[PDB]
Design a protein around this ligand. Structure first.
Ligand SMILES: Nc1ccc(/C=C\c2ccc(C(=O)O)cc2)cc1
Lengths: 8, 269
């Protein structure tokens, strides 16, 4: 399961 | 003189450079913010119009090590430059959870408690961060102290309704998803619930709008009942059903926290 950053 | 006071190093999108204060070889972060890209502005006591981020950083700058300290700032024709504290050695909490996976509850407790104190500090100073997440939390690996960073989405703390938001959608509460409104404290508690799940399960629980408003929390990792309950409480669909900061820090799962130095010796060295 791919974990990722999330821009703001 | 900006380039005459700091030795500028390499990048850390977003434009933050590693730097050293030539005065005392102090590690700093040098952050550039384009004027054309600035959401809210504020006025300093001088009346000099500055980005709201500068205003918020100054209001929280009073000495408590849980929040990143703004050391200086400069104005340029098309941008502002922020000189910020840089711990060294450091790693942000997002990379830390990526490398290590789900955290032991003892370590998640210490981190989450430190985030809670830091957010209390912001609110006491009249500042609402609005973008609490693992990416905006730095770990001083030798002191075991957490730092909250990037106030670029923040706002002055108020008790009335907010109808604007520029933080991270997957950490925003269902009332923002559904109705474009929220109150500051209860929306922060929701993001703290997302953060806590993120620490003990190794990733955030919700990626999609329907999941956020669904009010269902599935645990992918073995997580104690007391911790699951605190998480579910923070993630109450109704904002008024969420715990206060005091209720969170009195929760049974939050008792007997490690000191920062114990945390560094046991989990970081
Ligand atoms: N991954 C990583 C590494 C080093 C730093 C340094 C410090 C810093 C950077 C940005 C900010 C801010 O946006 O308020 C503050 C401090 C930050 C993140």
């Amino acid at each position: 399961r791919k974990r990722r950053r999330h821009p703001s | 003189p900006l380039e005459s006071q700091y030795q500028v190093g390499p990048l850390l999108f977003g434009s933050v450079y590693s730097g050293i204060r030539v005065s005392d070889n102090l590690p700093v972060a040098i952050k550039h913010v384009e004027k054309d890209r600035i959401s809210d502005w504020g006025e300093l006591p001088n009346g000099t119009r500055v980005p709201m981020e500068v205003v918020l950083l100054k209001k929280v700058s009073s000495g408590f090590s849980g929040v990143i300290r703004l050391l200086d700032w400069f104005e340029r024709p098309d941008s502002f430059v922020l000189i910020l504290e840089r711990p060294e050695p450091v790693q942000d909490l997002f990379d830390f959870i990526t490398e290590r996976g789900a955290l032991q509850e003892e370590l998640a407790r210490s981190f989450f408690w430190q985030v809670l104190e830091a957010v209390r500090h912001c609110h006491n100073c009249g500042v609402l961060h609005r973008d609490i997440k693992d990416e905006n939390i730095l770990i001083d690996l030798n002191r075991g102290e957490l730092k909250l960073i990037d106030f670029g989405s923040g706002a002055l703390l108020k008790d009335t309704v907010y109808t604007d938001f520029d933080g991270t959608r997957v950490y925003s509460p269902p009332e923002w998803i559904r109705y474009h409104r929220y109150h500051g404290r209860s929306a922060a508690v929701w993001s703290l619930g997302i953060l806590l799940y993120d620490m003990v399960c190794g990733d955030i629980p919700f990626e999609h709008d329907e999941e956020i408003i669904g009010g269902q929390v599935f645990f992918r990792q073995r997580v104690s009942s007391e911790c699951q309950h605190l998480i579910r409480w923070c993630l109450a669909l109704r904002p008024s059903d969420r715990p206060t900061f005091e209720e969170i820090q009195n929760h049974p799962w939050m008792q007997d926290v490690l000191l920062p130095q114990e945390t560094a010796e046991i989990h970081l060295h």
